[PDB]
Design a protein around this ligand. Structure first.
Ligand SMILES: [Cl-]
Ligand SMILES: [Cl-]
Ligand SMILES: [Cl-]
Ligand SMILES: [Cl-]
Ligand code: NA
Lengths: 293, 285
Protein backbone atom coordinates (compact mmCIF):
# COMPACT_ATOMS: atom_id res chain seq x y z
CA UNK A 1 0.00 0.00 0.00
CA UNK A 2 1.14 3.58 -0.55
CA UNK A 3 2.55 5.71 2.24
CA UNK A 4 -0.40 8.13 1.87
CA UNK A 5 -2.95 5.69 0.53
CA UNK A 6 -6.44 7.24 0.41
CA UNK A 7 -5.31 10.66 1.67
CA UNK A 8 -6.46 13.79 -0.16
CA UNK A 9 -3.60 16.27 -0.84
CA UNK A 10 -3.62 19.78 -2.23
CA UNK A 11 -0.32 20.97 -3.82
CA UNK A 12 -0.15 24.65 -4.77
CA UNK A 13 1.80 25.78 -7.83
CA UNK A 14 1.85 22.14 -8.96
CA UNK A 15 1.93 22.68 -12.74
CA UNK A 16 5.74 22.42 -13.00
CA UNK A 17 9.02 22.23 -11.08
CA UNK A 18 9.05 21.10 -7.48
CA UNK A 19 5.25 21.38 -7.16
CA UNK A 20 4.78 19.01 -10.05
CA UNK A 21 7.25 16.61 -8.47
CA UNK A 22 5.25 16.68 -5.20
CA UNK A 23 1.97 16.03 -7.05
CA UNK A 24 3.35 12.98 -8.90
CA UNK A 25 5.10 11.71 -5.70
CA UNK A 26 1.90 11.87 -3.65
CA UNK A 27 -0.19 10.20 -6.35
CA UNK A 28 2.50 7.45 -6.68
CA UNK A 29 1.98 6.70 -2.95
CA UNK A 30 -1.78 6.42 -3.25
CA UNK A 31 -3.02 9.97 -2.58
CA UNK A 32 -5.85 11.72 -4.44
CA UNK A 33 -4.36 14.97 -5.58
CA UNK A 34 -5.68 18.46 -6.14
CA UNK A 35 -3.19 19.92 -8.64
CA UNK A 36 -3.50 23.67 -8.05
CA UNK A 37 -1.79 26.03 -10.49
CA UNK A 38 -2.83 29.39 -11.96
CA UNK A 39 -1.30 28.64 -15.38
CA UNK A 40 -3.99 29.10 -18.00
CA UNK A 41 -5.32 26.52 -20.42
CA UNK A 42 -6.06 26.99 -24.12
CA UNK A 43 -9.14 29.11 -23.37
CA UNK A 44 -7.16 31.47 -21.14
CA UNK A 45 -8.79 30.43 -17.87
CA UNK A 46 -6.61 29.09 -15.01
CA UNK A 47 -6.01 25.32 -14.92
CA UNK A 48 -8.43 24.51 -17.79
CA UNK A 49 -7.93 22.16 -20.74
CA UNK A 50 -4.42 22.58 -22.18
CA UNK A 51 -3.02 24.00 -18.90
CA UNK A 52 0.05 22.89 -16.97
CA UNK A 53 -2.25 21.73 -14.12
CA UNK A 54 -4.26 19.54 -16.49
CA UNK A 55 -1.07 18.12 -18.01
CA UNK A 56 0.09 17.02 -14.55
CA UNK A 57 -3.38 15.61 -13.81
CA UNK A 58 -3.14 13.61 -17.09
CA UNK A 59 0.29 12.27 -16.06
CA UNK A 60 -1.18 11.11 -12.76
CA UNK A 61 -4.24 9.50 -14.35
CA UNK A 62 -2.15 7.80 -17.06
CA UNK A 63 -0.08 6.21 -14.25
CA UNK A 64 -3.31 4.82 -12.61
CA UNK A 65 -3.82 7.58 -9.99
CA UNK A 66 -6.56 10.12 -9.27
CA UNK A 67 -6.24 13.90 -9.50
CA UNK A 68 -8.12 17.03 -10.43
CA UNK A 69 -6.96 20.45 -11.63
CA UNK A 70 -7.70 23.65 -9.77
CA UNK A 71 -6.94 27.19 -10.84
CA UNK A 72 -7.25 29.09 -7.57
CA UNK A 73 -4.87 31.98 -7.00
CA UNK A 74 -3.79 31.39 -3.40
CA UNK A 75 -2.90 35.09 -2.93
CA UNK A 76 -6.65 35.81 -3.39
CA UNK A 77 -8.15 35.09 0.05
CA UNK A 78 -11.49 33.87 -1.28
CA UNK A 79 -9.96 31.70 -3.98
CA UNK A 80 -7.76 30.10 -1.31
CA UNK A 81 -10.97 29.22 0.55
CA UNK A 82 -12.43 27.77 -2.66
CA UNK A 83 -9.31 25.64 -3.13
CA UNK A 84 -10.00 23.87 0.20
CA UNK A 85 -13.60 23.33 -0.99
CA UNK A 86 -12.38 21.78 -4.27
CA UNK A 87 -10.69 19.06 -2.28
CA UNK A 88 -13.67 18.48 0.01
CA UNK A 89 -16.22 18.51 -2.86
CA UNK A 90 -14.23 16.39 -5.26
CA UNK A 91 -12.75 13.82 -2.93
CA UNK A 92 -14.84 14.05 0.28
CA UNK A 93 -12.29 15.67 2.62
CA UNK A 94 -8.71 16.99 2.93
CA UNK A 95 -5.72 15.45 4.71
CA UNK A 96 -2.63 17.28 3.47
CA UNK A 97 -1.93 20.84 2.32
CA UNK A 98 1.40 21.46 0.56
CA UNK A 99 2.15 25.15 0.14
CA UNK A 100 4.62 25.48 -2.78
CA UNK A 101 3.40 28.26 -5.12
CA UNK A 102 6.00 30.97 -5.56
CA UNK A 103 7.53 33.58 -7.83
CA UNK A 104 10.84 35.47 -7.78
CA UNK A 105 11.46 39.13 -8.59
CA UNK A 106 15.14 39.27 -7.60
CA UNK A 107 16.47 42.81 -6.93
CA UNK A 108 18.82 44.52 -4.49
CA UNK A 109 16.73 46.11 -1.71
CA UNK A 110 17.76 49.54 -3.03
CA UNK A 111 16.47 48.67 -6.49
CA UNK A 112 13.21 46.86 -5.64
CA UNK A 113 10.00 48.33 -7.06
CA UNK A 114 6.76 48.45 -5.02
CA UNK A 115 5.19 45.90 -7.37
CA UNK A 116 8.24 43.62 -7.09
CA UNK A 117 7.97 43.65 -3.29
CA UNK A 118 4.14 43.30 -3.31
CA UNK A 119 3.99 40.38 -5.76
CA UNK A 120 6.59 38.24 -3.98
CA UNK A 121 5.00 38.86 -0.54
CA UNK A 122 1.51 38.13 -1.91
CA UNK A 123 2.27 34.82 -3.68
CA UNK A 124 4.59 33.35 -1.03
CA UNK A 125 3.55 34.73 2.36
CA UNK A 126 -0.09 35.71 1.82
CA UNK A 127 -0.67 32.57 -0.29
CA UNK A 128 0.77 30.30 2.40
CA UNK A 129 -1.19 32.18 5.16
CA UNK A 130 -4.51 32.12 3.25
CA UNK A 131 -4.46 28.36 2.65
CA UNK A 132 -3.38 27.73 6.25
CA UNK A 133 -6.26 29.93 7.50
CA UNK A 134 -8.86 28.07 5.47
CA UNK A 135 -7.52 24.52 5.90
CA UNK A 136 -7.15 24.98 9.66
CA UNK A 137 -10.73 26.26 9.96
CA UNK A 138 -11.88 23.22 7.98
CA UNK A 139 -9.98 20.75 10.18
CA UNK A 140 -11.01 22.51 13.39
CA UNK A 141 -14.64 22.19 12.22
CA UNK A 142 -14.26 18.44 11.67
CA UNK A 143 -12.72 18.12 15.14
CA UNK A 144 -15.59 20.10 16.71
CA UNK A 145 -17.97 17.65 14.99
CA UNK A 146 -16.19 14.62 16.47
CA UNK A 147 -14.63 13.58 13.16
CA UNK A 148 -11.29 12.03 12.39
CA UNK A 149 -8.48 14.56 12.01
CA UNK A 150 -4.91 13.59 11.21
CA UNK A 151 -4.13 16.59 9.04
CA UNK A 152 -0.84 17.93 7.71
CA UNK A 153 0.50 21.24 6.43
CA UNK A 154 3.86 21.28 4.66
CA UNK A 155 5.16 24.76 3.85
CA UNK A 156 8.04 25.82 1.62
CA UNK A 157 10.66 28.07 3.21
CA UNK A 158 14.28 28.48 2.05
CA UNK A 159 17.76 29.12 3.33
CA UNK A 160 17.03 32.60 2.00
CA UNK A 161 14.28 32.93 4.66
CA UNK A 162 16.50 31.51 7.45
CA UNK A 163 19.85 33.25 6.93
CA UNK A 164 19.07 35.71 4.12
CA UNK A 165 20.01 35.81 0.43
CA UNK A 166 21.77 38.81 -1.22
CA UNK A 167 19.74 40.25 -4.10
CA UNK A 168 16.64 38.44 -2.80
CA UNK A 169 15.42 40.73 0.03
CA UNK A 170 11.74 40.43 -0.89
CA UNK A 171 11.90 36.61 -1.30
CA UNK A 172 14.02 36.23 1.87
CA UNK A 173 11.47 38.24 3.92
CA UNK A 174 8.58 36.18 2.56
CA UNK A 175 10.31 32.83 3.22
CA UNK A 176 11.25 34.04 6.72
CA UNK A 177 7.59 34.86 7.41
CA UNK A 178 6.78 31.31 6.19
CA UNK A 179 9.37 29.70 8.55
CA UNK A 180 7.90 31.50 11.59
CA UNK A 181 4.32 30.94 10.47
CA UNK A 182 5.19 27.22 10.42
CA UNK A 183 6.28 27.46 14.07
CA UNK A 184 3.08 29.27 15.09
CA UNK A 185 0.79 26.98 13.05
CA UNK A 186 2.36 23.96 14.68
CA UNK A 187 1.69 25.39 18.15
CA UNK A 188 -1.92 26.40 17.39
CA UNK A 189 -3.19 23.50 15.30
CA UNK A 190 -1.84 20.41 17.16
CA UNK A 191 -4.93 20.80 19.39
CA UNK A 192 -7.10 19.49 16.59
CA UNK A 193 -4.76 16.91 15.11
CA UNK A 194 -2.85 18.98 12.54
CA UNK A 195 0.93 19.03 12.19
CA UNK A 196 2.73 21.90 10.51
CA UNK A 197 6.27 21.64 9.10
CA UNK A 198 8.33 23.17 6.33
CA UNK A 199 10.89 22.12 3.78
CA UNK A 200 13.66 24.39 2.41
CA UNK A 201 14.93 23.06 -0.95
CA UNK A 202 18.53 24.08 -1.65
CA UNK A 203 19.10 27.02 -4.01
CA UNK A 204 20.82 24.71 -6.54
CA UNK A 205 17.83 22.36 -6.73
CA UNK A 206 16.40 22.74 -10.27
CA UNK A 207 13.19 24.73 -9.77
CA UNK A 208 12.36 26.28 -13.13
CA UNK A 209 10.20 24.52 -15.67
CA UNK A 210 11.54 23.74 -19.11
CA UNK A 211 9.78 22.44 -22.19
CA UNK A 212 11.49 19.09 -22.84
CA UNK A 213 12.11 16.13 -20.52
CA UNK A 214 14.00 12.88 -21.14
CA UNK A 215 22.05 10.24 -9.75
CA UNK A 216 21.07 13.87 -10.48
CA UNK A 217 21.29 15.29 -6.92
CA UNK A 218 19.66 18.58 -7.99
CA UNK A 219 16.48 17.07 -9.57
CA UNK A 220 13.31 18.48 -8.00
CA UNK A 221 11.98 14.90 -7.56
CA UNK A 222 14.56 14.45 -4.75
CA UNK A 223 12.75 17.06 -2.58
CA UNK A 224 9.37 15.34 -2.59
CA UNK A 225 9.99 12.06 -0.60
CA UNK A 226 10.21 13.89 2.74
CA UNK A 227 7.07 15.92 1.91
CA UNK A 228 5.15 12.73 1.19
CA UNK A 229 6.39 11.12 4.41
CA UNK A 230 5.46 14.20 6.51
CA UNK A 231 1.96 13.99 4.93
CA UNK A 232 1.60 10.36 6.20
CA UNK A 233 -0.10 8.91 9.30
CA UNK A 234 3.32 7.84 10.59
CA UNK A 235 4.50 11.47 10.83
CA UNK A 236 1.89 12.39 13.48
CA UNK A 237 4.57 13.19 16.08
CA UNK A 238 6.57 15.54 13.91
CA UNK A 239 5.54 19.19 14.01
CA UNK A 240 7.09 22.69 13.96
CA UNK A 241 10.16 21.42 12.09
CA UNK A 242 12.08 22.96 9.21
CA UNK A 243 14.06 20.54 7.05
CA UNK A 244 16.61 21.63 4.50
CA UNK A 245 16.72 19.17 1.55
CA UNK A 246 18.68 18.52 -1.66
CA UNK A 247 19.39 15.19 -3.42
CA UNK A 248 19.73 12.55 -0.71
CA UNK A 249 20.45 15.08 2.06
CA UNK A 250 18.05 16.01 4.86
CA UNK A 251 19.21 18.52 7.47
CA UNK A 252 17.28 19.82 10.46
CA UNK A 253 17.41 23.65 10.69
CA UNK A 254 17.78 24.77 14.35
CA UNK A 255 15.89 27.93 15.27
CA UNK A 256 16.90 31.25 16.85
CA UNK A 257 18.57 30.79 20.22
CA UNK A 258 19.39 32.91 23.27
CA UNK A 259 22.99 34.05 23.02
CA UNK A 260 25.16 36.04 25.48
CA UNK A 261 23.33 38.39 27.85
CA UNK A 262 24.30 41.20 30.21
CA UNK A 263 22.03 42.93 32.73
CA UNK A 264 22.78 46.39 34.22
CA UNK A 265 19.75 46.07 36.48
CA UNK A 266 19.29 49.78 35.73
CA UNK A 267 18.88 52.02 32.60
CA UNK A 268 21.92 52.03 30.25
CA UNK A 269 23.75 55.22 29.38
CA UNK A 270 24.14 55.05 25.55
CA UNK A 271 27.70 56.38 25.92
CA UNK A 272 28.74 53.29 27.93
CA UNK A 273 27.50 50.61 25.45
CA UNK A 274 30.54 50.19 23.17
CA UNK A 275 32.48 47.85 25.46
CA UNK A 276 29.24 46.14 26.55
CA UNK A 277 28.24 45.33 22.93
CA UNK A 278 31.81 44.34 21.96
CA UNK A 279 31.89 41.91 24.90
CA UNK A 280 28.57 40.28 23.94
CA UNK A 281 29.37 39.98 20.25
CA UNK A 282 32.76 38.31 20.71
CA UNK A 283 31.05 35.69 22.84
CA UNK A 284 28.16 35.07 20.39
CA UNK A 285 28.04 32.01 18.15
CA UNK A 286 29.24 32.70 14.57
CA UNK A 287 26.14 32.80 12.32
CA UNK A 288 25.50 30.83 9.14
CA UNK A 289 26.56 33.50 6.55
CA UNK A 290 24.02 35.24 4.35
CA UNK A 291 23.67 33.34 1.05
CA UNK A 292 25.41 35.09 -1.85
CA UNK A 293 27.44 37.36 0.42
CA UNK B 1 29.26 66.15 23.01
CA UNK B 2 26.29 63.81 22.40
CA UNK B 3 26.76 60.16 21.32
CA UNK B 4 24.91 60.93 18.05
CA UNK B 5 25.76 64.61 17.96
CA UNK B 6 24.71 66.17 14.65
CA UNK B 7 23.41 62.94 13.19
CA UNK B 8 20.12 63.26 11.35
CA UNK B 9 17.65 60.49 12.41
CA UNK B 10 14.14 59.40 11.38
CA UNK B 11 11.97 57.50 13.90
CA UNK B 12 8.75 56.04 12.54
CA UNK B 13 5.70 55.81 14.77
CA UNK B 14 7.41 58.26 17.09
CA UNK B 15 4.29 59.95 18.51
CA UNK B 16 4.02 57.67 21.59
CA UNK B 17 5.47 54.66 23.44
CA UNK B 18 8.88 53.31 22.47
CA UNK B 19 8.95 55.41 19.28
CA UNK B 20 8.63 58.53 21.45
CA UNK B 21 11.34 57.19 23.82
CA UNK B 22 13.65 56.71 20.77
CA UNK B 23 12.99 60.22 19.43
CA UNK B 24 13.71 61.91 22.79
CA UNK B 25 16.74 59.69 23.44
CA UNK B 26 18.37 60.62 20.09
CA UNK B 27 17.70 64.35 20.67
CA UNK B 28 19.15 64.14 24.19
CA UNK B 29 22.37 62.84 22.62
CA UNK B 30 22.52 65.65 20.04
CA UNK B 31 20.73 64.26 16.98
CA UNK B 32 18.37 66.26 14.81
CA UNK B 33 15.16 64.20 14.70
CA UNK B 34 12.38 63.68 12.17
CA UNK B 35 9.39 62.62 14.21
CA UNK B 36 7.26 60.53 11.93
CA UNK B 37 3.77 59.63 13.13
CA UNK B 38 0.48 59.39 11.25
CA UNK B 39 -1.64 60.60 14.21
CA UNK B 40 -3.74 63.62 13.22
CA UNK B 41 -3.56 67.12 14.67
CA UNK B 42 -6.44 69.49 15.35
CA UNK B 43 -7.05 70.18 11.63
CA UNK B 44 -7.56 66.42 11.07
CA UNK B 45 -4.43 65.86 8.98
CA UNK B 46 -1.44 63.69 10.01
CA UNK B 47 1.30 65.28 12.19
CA UNK B 48 -0.12 68.83 12.24
CA UNK B 49 -0.52 71.35 15.11
CA UNK B 50 -1.95 69.49 18.14
CA UNK B 51 -0.75 66.03 16.86
CA UNK B 52 1.22 63.35 18.70
CA UNK B 53 4.22 63.98 16.40
CA UNK B 54 4.22 67.74 17.03
CA UNK B 55 3.77 67.21 20.76
CA UNK B 56 6.95 65.15 20.80
CA UNK B 57 8.72 67.73 18.63
CA UNK B 58 7.76 70.38 21.25
CA UNK B 59 9.28 68.15 23.91
CA UNK B 60 12.55 68.02 21.96
CA UNK B 61 12.80 71.83 21.33
CA UNK B 62 12.05 72.67 24.98
CA UNK B 63 14.91 70.47 26.15
CA UNK B 64 16.90 72.48 23.57
CA UNK B 65 17.02 70.11 20.58
CA UNK B 66 16.10 70.29 16.88
CA UNK B 67 13.20 68.24 15.42
CA UNK B 68 10.54 68.26 12.68
CA UNK B 69 7.15 66.49 12.47
CA UNK B 70 6.33 64.31 9.47
CA UNK B 71 3.01 62.64 8.70
CA UNK B 72 4.01 60.02 6.13
CA UNK B 73 2.36 56.61 6.27
CA UNK B 74 5.36 54.31 5.70
CA UNK B 75 3.02 51.53 4.40
CA UNK B 76 2.44 53.84 1.43
CA UNK B 77 5.49 53.42 -0.82
CA UNK B 78 5.49 56.98 -2.18
CA UNK B 79 5.04 58.46 1.30
CA UNK B 80 7.99 56.43 2.55
CA UNK B 81 10.09 57.92 -0.28
CA UNK B 82 8.88 61.40 0.82
CA UNK B 83 9.82 60.71 4.46
CA UNK B 84 13.44 60.17 3.37
CA UNK B 85 13.23 63.40 1.31
CA UNK B 86 11.85 65.33 4.31
CA UNK B 87 14.98 64.45 6.32
CA UNK B 88 17.28 65.48 3.47
CA UNK B 89 15.44 68.74 2.68
CA UNK B 90 15.03 69.74 6.33
CA UNK B 91 18.46 68.95 7.82
CA UNK B 92 20.51 68.44 4.63
CA UNK B 93 21.12 64.73 5.11
CA UNK B 94 20.21 61.40 6.71
CA UNK B 95 22.38 59.36 9.04
CA UNK B 96 19.91 57.07 10.92
CA UNK B 97 16.63 55.31 10.07
CA UNK B 98 14.76 53.72 12.99
CA UNK B 99 11.87 51.59 11.86
CA UNK B 100 9.42 51.35 14.78
CA UNK B 101 5.88 51.89 13.46
CA UNK B 102 3.63 48.92 14.34
CA UNK B 103 0.18 47.55 15.08
CA UNK B 104 -1.30 44.28 16.37
CA UNK B 105 -4.51 42.61 15.23
CA UNK B 106 -4.24 39.35 17.17
CA UNK B 107 -6.10 36.21 16.06
CA UNK B 108 -5.39 32.51 15.80
CA UNK B 109 -4.43 31.65 12.22
CA UNK B 110 -7.69 29.68 11.76
CA UNK B 111 -9.71 32.84 12.60
CA UNK B 112 -7.60 35.52 10.90
CA UNK B 113 -9.51 37.73 8.40
CA UNK B 114 -7.87 39.06 5.21
CA UNK B 115 -7.87 42.57 6.71
CA UNK B 116 -6.13 41.35 9.91
CA UNK B 117 -3.42 39.77 7.81
CA UNK B 118 -3.04 42.64 5.32
CA UNK B 119 -2.93 45.46 7.87
CA UNK B 120 -0.30 43.86 10.04
CA UNK B 121 1.92 42.89 7.11
CA UNK B 122 1.53 46.39 5.56
CA UNK B 123 2.44 48.42 8.62
CA UNK B 124 5.33 46.23 9.81
CA UNK B 125 6.90 44.46 6.85
CA UNK B 126 6.01 46.78 3.92
CA UNK B 127 6.58 49.85 6.14
CA UNK B 128 10.02 48.53 7.08
CA UNK B 129 10.95 47.48 3.53
CA UNK B 130 9.70 50.73 1.96
CA UNK B 131 11.85 52.97 4.19
CA UNK B 132 14.89 50.72 3.81
CA UNK B 133 14.47 50.75 0.03
CA UNK B 134 14.33 54.54 -0.18
CA UNK B 135 17.03 55.22 2.40
CA UNK B 136 19.36 52.72 0.67
CA UNK B 137 18.75 54.18 -2.82
CA UNK B 138 19.72 57.56 -1.30
CA UNK B 139 22.84 56.36 0.56
CA UNK B 140 23.84 54.33 -2.51
CA UNK B 141 23.55 57.53 -4.59
CA UNK B 142 25.83 59.50 -2.26
CA UNK B 143 28.38 56.67 -2.14
CA UNK B 144 28.49 56.16 -5.93
CA UNK B 145 29.17 59.93 -6.10
CA UNK B 146 32.15 59.61 -3.72
CA UNK B 147 30.38 61.44 -0.89
CA UNK B 148 30.47 60.64 2.84
CA UNK B 149 28.20 57.76 4.02
CA UNK B 150 28.21 56.47 7.61
CA UNK B 151 24.57 55.32 7.74
CA UNK B 152 22.48 53.25 10.12
CA UNK B 153 19.23 51.34 9.94
CA UNK B 154 17.78 49.96 13.15
CA UNK B 155 14.72 47.79 12.62
CA UNK B 156 12.19 46.52 15.15
CA UNK B 157 11.73 42.75 15.18
CA UNK B 158 10.27 40.75 18.14
CA UNK B 159 10.63 37.41 19.88
CA UNK B 160 7.36 36.75 17.96
CA UNK B 161 9.39 36.89 14.73
CA UNK B 162 12.22 34.76 16.08
CA UNK B 163 10.41 31.90 17.79
CA UNK B 164 6.74 32.66 16.99
CA UNK B 165 3.87 33.77 19.21
CA UNK B 166 0.56 31.94 19.63
CA UNK B 167 -2.50 33.98 18.66
CA UNK B 168 -0.21 36.37 16.71
CA UNK B 169 0.67 34.47 13.51
CA UNK B 170 0.24 37.66 11.44
CA UNK B 171 2.51 39.73 13.70
CA UNK B 172 5.02 36.84 14.03
CA UNK B 173 5.28 36.48 10.24
CA UNK B 174 5.79 40.22 9.77
CA UNK B 175 8.48 40.38 12.49
CA UNK B 176 10.24 37.32 11.06
CA UNK B 177 10.36 39.01 7.62
CA UNK B 178 11.91 42.03 9.37
CA UNK B 179 14.58 39.91 11.11
CA UNK B 180 15.74 38.33 7.83
CA UNK B 181 15.42 41.66 5.96
CA UNK B 182 17.87 43.02 8.53
CA UNK B 183 20.33 40.22 7.66
CA UNK B 184 20.00 40.82 3.91
CA UNK B 185 20.14 44.66 4.33
CA UNK B 186 23.35 44.29 6.37
CA UNK B 187 24.96 42.16 3.62
CA UNK B 188 23.87 44.45 0.78
CA UNK B 189 24.38 47.91 2.31
CA UNK B 190 27.78 47.48 3.92
CA UNK B 191 29.19 48.12 0.40
CA UNK B 192 28.17 51.76 0.80
CA UNK B 193 28.88 52.33 4.53
CA UNK B 194 25.47 51.45 5.99
CA UNK B 195 24.97 49.10 8.95
CA UNK B 196 21.65 47.32 9.46
CA UNK B 197 20.61 45.92 12.86
CA UNK B 198 17.44 45.11 14.73
CA UNK B 199 16.08 45.22 18.24
CA UNK B 200 13.49 42.91 19.74
CA UNK B 201 12.03 44.58 22.82
CA UNK B 202 10.88 41.99 25.43
CA UNK B 203 7.22 40.90 25.79
CA UNK B 204 6.90 42.57 29.20
CA UNK B 205 8.24 45.99 27.99
CA UNK B 206 5.34 48.52 28.12
CA UNK B 207 13.89 51.20 38.57
CA UNK B 208 11.01 50.42 36.26
CA UNK B 209 12.40 47.60 34.07
CA UNK B 210 9.42 47.58 31.67
CA UNK B 211 9.59 51.34 30.92
CA UNK B 212 10.02 51.96 27.13
CA UNK B 213 12.88 54.37 27.83
CA UNK B 214 15.05 51.40 28.77
CA UNK B 215 15.05 50.10 25.19
CA UNK B 216 16.28 53.33 23.54
CA UNK B 217 19.89 53.49 24.75
CA UNK B 218 21.06 50.62 22.53
CA UNK B 219 19.28 52.11 19.49
CA UNK B 220 20.99 55.48 20.11
CA UNK B 221 24.35 53.68 20.44
CA UNK B 222 23.77 51.63 17.26
CA UNK B 223 23.10 54.84 15.35
CA UNK B 224 26.43 56.26 16.52
CA UNK B 225 29.74 56.62 14.74
CA UNK B 226 31.23 54.19 17.27
CA UNK B 227 28.87 51.45 16.02
CA UNK B 228 30.40 51.32 12.51
CA UNK B 229 31.55 47.66 12.92
CA UNK B 230 28.26 46.26 14.25
CA UNK B 231 25.99 44.99 11.46
CA UNK B 232 23.51 42.16 10.87
CA UNK B 233 22.76 41.77 14.57
CA UNK B 234 19.51 41.18 16.44
CA UNK B 235 19.48 42.24 20.06
CA UNK B 236 16.78 41.29 22.56
CA UNK B 237 16.23 44.21 24.99
CA UNK B 238 14.37 44.77 28.31
CA UNK B 239 15.27 47.07 31.21
CA UNK B 240 19.00 46.70 31.82
CA UNK B 241 19.14 43.47 29.78
CA UNK B 242 20.75 43.12 26.37
CA UNK B 243 20.93 39.66 24.80
CA UNK B 244 22.33 38.72 21.35
CA UNK B 245 19.90 36.51 19.41
CA UNK B 246 21.74 33.74 17.58
CA UNK B 247 20.37 32.90 14.11
CA UNK B 248 19.18 29.72 12.45
CA UNK B 249 21.83 27.08 12.60
CA UNK B 250 22.73 23.91 10.75
CA UNK B 251 21.48 20.93 12.76
CA UNK B 252 21.98 17.18 12.17
CA UNK B 253 22.10 15.95 8.57
CA UNK B 254 21.93 12.59 6.85
CA UNK B 255 22.76 11.84 3.18
CA UNK B 256 21.49 8.73 1.33
CA UNK B 257 23.53 9.70 -1.77
CA UNK B 258 20.44 8.64 -3.75
CA UNK B 259 16.68 9.56 -3.78
CA UNK B 260 14.83 8.65 -0.60
CA UNK B 261 11.85 6.32 -0.64
CA UNK B 262 9.10 8.01 1.39
CA UNK B 263 8.34 4.68 3.06
CA UNK B 264 11.80 4.52 4.74
CA UNK B 265 11.86 8.01 6.26
CA UNK B 266 10.25 7.26 9.67
CA UNK B 267 13.41 6.07 11.46
CA UNK B 268 15.54 8.52 9.48
CA UNK B 269 13.55 11.51 10.67
CA UNK B 270 13.32 10.03 14.22
CA UNK B 271 17.13 9.75 14.33
CA UNK B 272 17.69 13.29 13.06
CA UNK B 273 15.19 14.79 15.49
CA UNK B 274 16.80 12.87 18.37
CA UNK B 275 20.08 14.68 17.65
CA UNK B 276 18.60 18.11 16.96
CA UNK B 277 18.76 20.91 19.51
CA UNK B 278 15.45 21.56 21.32
CA UNK B 279 14.08 24.93 20.19
CA UNK B 280 13.29 27.98 22.29
CA UNK B 281 9.50 27.42 22.64
CA UNK B 282 6.87 29.40 20.78
CA UNK B 283 5.79 32.37 22.96
CA UNK B 284 2.36 31.79 24.48
CA UNK B 285 2.41 28.03 23.97
CL1 LIG C 1 9.65 30.66 -6.04
CL1 LIG D 1 18.82 45.11 -8.52
CL1 LIG E 1 -8.92 33.82 17.62
CL1 LIG F 1 15.51 40.12 27.04
NA1 NA G 1 6.59 1.18 -1.43
Amino acid sequence: MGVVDGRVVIVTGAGGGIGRAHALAFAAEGARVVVNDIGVGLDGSPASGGSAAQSVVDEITAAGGEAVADGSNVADWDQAAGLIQTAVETFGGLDVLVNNAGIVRDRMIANTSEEEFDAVIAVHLKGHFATMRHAAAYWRGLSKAGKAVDGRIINTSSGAGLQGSVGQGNYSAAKAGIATLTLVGAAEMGRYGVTVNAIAPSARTRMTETVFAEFDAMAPENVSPLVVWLGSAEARDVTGKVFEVEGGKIRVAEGWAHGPQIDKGARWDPAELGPVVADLLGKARPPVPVYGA
